[PDB]
Design an enzyme around this catalytic site. Structure first.
Site, PDB file in Angstrom:
ATOM      1  N   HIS A 137       5.607 -41.164  -4.909  1.00  0.00           N
ATOM      2  CA  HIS A 137       5.190 -39.973  -5.642  1.00  0.00           C
ATOM      3  C   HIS A 137       4.286 -40.343  -6.812  1.00  0.00           C
ATOM      4  O   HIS A 137       3.198 -39.780  -6.976  1.00  0.00           O
ATOM      5  CB  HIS A 137       6.427 -39.212  -6.125  1.00  0.00           C
ATOM      6  N   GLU A 138       4.722 -41.299  -7.636  1.00  0.00           N
ATOM      7  CA  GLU A 138       3.921 -41.709  -8.785  1.00  0.00           C
ATOM      8  C   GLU A 138       2.612 -42.360  -8.359  1.00  0.00           C
ATOM      9  O   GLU A 138       1.600 -42.224  -9.055  1.00  0.00           O
ATOM     10  CB  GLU A 138       4.726 -42.656  -9.673  1.00  0.00           C
TER      11      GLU A 138
ATOM     12  N   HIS B 269       0.006 -39.669  -7.832  1.00  0.00           N
ATOM     13  CA  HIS B 269      -0.599 -39.261  -9.096  1.00  0.00           C
ATOM     14  C   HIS B 269      -1.672 -40.252  -9.528  1.00  0.00           C
ATOM     15  O   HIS B 269      -2.785 -39.861  -9.900  1.00  0.00           O
ATOM     16  CB  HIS B 269       0.472 -39.128 -10.178  1.00  0.00           C
TER      17      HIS B 269
ATOM     18  N   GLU C 167       1.317 -31.104  -9.785  1.00  0.00           N
ATOM     19  CA  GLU C 167       2.642 -31.394  -9.243  1.00  0.00           C
ATOM     20  C   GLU C 167       2.828 -30.751  -7.875  1.00  0.00           C
ATOM     21  O   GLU C 167       3.296 -31.398  -6.932  1.00  0.00           O
ATOM     22  CB  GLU C 167       3.725 -30.920 -10.214  1.00  0.00           C
TER      23      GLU C 167
HETATM   24 CU   LIG Z   1       0.872 -39.130 -14.231  1.00  0.00          CU
HETATM   25 CU   LIG Z   2       4.726 -35.476 -10.024  1.00  0.00          CU
END
Ligand SMILES: [Cu+2]
Ligand SMILES: [Cu+2]
Length: 421
Positions: A222-223, A226, A261
């Site tokens: 997930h990170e 990003h 998100e």
């Molecule tokens: Cu971030």
């Molecule tokens: Cu996130």
């Protein structure tokens, strides 16, 4: 094999991949021992007390912005043994992500996502941004500047607040102008969230004790998504929020959720971004890739002796997949742009990584974290590169029993509940 060396934290420094380094943008810090586990990716097995002024101590006493979910432990990750496990735990998660076709593509995109050399006040010259460098200490004791894309570091005060951060520039919005910038991910493989398998329960703030545990590989993945967005400068401004109308408890609390998100989770949550504004973002960031080519074409010489102009123009044509012509001018092919843009925004998603990991995972970003467990993924009897907690040929292989905190007791110690508060 995404990490060639099995690093031990006590391994002697060599000034290449095991060195004491300094973060230039911080401004004041003692050198920290770092480990380069892969080209352009470093791991700092330490608490993050450098990347921002307002978090120099690990003590729970701030009035900045409290959160229903939080956990503090000022002594975590301070002993050399814990740092050794942190480095070994982060390594195993990278390999786990790398063993999947989806993760191998993501990591490839991350290594390619070199921050743009757009820090020259003379458009006829290509020059680096000092935001995207680290200072490595050489065997002679002097410092060496080193470009890197991603940096994994331990969490700050709140241990379970996993973020991806990058240092800003005077005027340029690097994470939202196509340039990109070196990303710092606050992460810990020694903790994991608990969630409920039922949707009615996981989205209710008063139900569930966190029966199932989150696979930390998805958490790191997930990170990484990003960082992927911000390394390519296509991150959606965090002010672009979406008010959830489909949750009675979110609605009664007025809690927003950024498009970044909802996009990162993908699956059914990304729908909440209407087609109108998706083309709004797609076109907007596509135009930012034009300026990069426009800037890339006006460049006739390069600053520094690190790399030649032709090599840097090629790396940026590989990154943004520019359309290179006989003349040598770089342009942006819309067909190729939409593929890279869709690859970074719609293919790399938490939902898609759940399919490749074959694990149980919360079905929406709009839920209520139930509990936070203490884990140890280093031992192979606990966690494997290819199965996570759902070890094969054991009672933990079926029904995600490895993630069932009630069936796999020895692997999870509940540290704090979140339901009711
Ligand atoms: Cu971030
Ligand atoms: Cu996130």
């Amino acid at each position: 094999q995404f990490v060639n060396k099995q690093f031990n934290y006590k391994d002697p420094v060599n000034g290449v991949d095991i060195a004491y380094i300094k973060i230039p943008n911080v401004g004041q810090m003692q050198p920290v021992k770092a480990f380069k586990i892969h080209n352009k990716i470093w791991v700092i097995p330490e608490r993050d007390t450098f990347t921002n002024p307002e978090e120099g101590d690990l003590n729970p006493p701030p009035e900045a912005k409290q959160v229903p979910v939080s956990y503090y432990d000022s002594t975590y990750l301070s002993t050399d043994n814990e740092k050794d496990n942190y480095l070994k735990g982060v390594t195993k998660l990278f390999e786990r992500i790398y063993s999947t076709d989806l993760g191998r593509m993501l990591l490839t995109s991350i290594v390619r996502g070199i921050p743009f050399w757009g820090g020259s006040t003379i458009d006829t010259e290509l020059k680096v941004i000092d935001t995207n460098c680290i200072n490595v200490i050489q065997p002679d004791g002097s410092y060496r500047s080193e470009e890197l894309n991603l940096v994994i570091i331990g969490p700050s005060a709140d241990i379970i607040q996993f973020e991806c951060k990058s240092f800003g520039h005077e005027v340029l919005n690097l994470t939202r102008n196509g340039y990109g910038s070196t990303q710092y991910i606050r992460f810990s493989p020694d903790f994991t969230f608990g969630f409920e398998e039922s949707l009615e329960v996981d989205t209710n703030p008063l139900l569930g004790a966190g029966k199932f545990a989150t696979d930390p590989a998805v958490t790191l993945a997930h990170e990484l998504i990003h960082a992927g967005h911000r390394l390519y400068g296509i991150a959606i401004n965090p002010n672009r929020v979406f008010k959830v109308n489909t949750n009675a408890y979110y609605e009664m609390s007025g809690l927003e959720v950024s498009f970044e998100e909802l996009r990162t989770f993908g699956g059914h949550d990304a729908k909440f971004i209407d087609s109108l504004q998706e083309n709004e973002f797609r076109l907007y960031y596509y135009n930012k890739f034009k300026d990069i080519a426009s800037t890339l074409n006006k460049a006739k010489s390069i600053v520094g002796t690190t790399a030649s102009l032709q090599y840097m123009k090629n790396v940026f044509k590989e990154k943004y997949l520019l359309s290179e012509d006989t003349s040598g001018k770089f342009s942006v092919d819309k067909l190729k742009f939409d593929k890279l843009y869709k690859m970074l925004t719609e293919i790399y998603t938490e939902d898609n990584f759940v399919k490749f990991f074959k694990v149980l995972n919360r079905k929406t970003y709009l839920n209520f974290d139930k509990a936070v467990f203490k884990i140890n993924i280093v031992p192979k009897v606990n966690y494997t590169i290819y199965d996570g907690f759902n070890l094969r040929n054991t009672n933990l292989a079926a029904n995600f029993n490895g993630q069932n905190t009630e069936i796999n007791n020895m692997n999870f110690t509940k540290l704090k509940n979140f339901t009711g508060l």
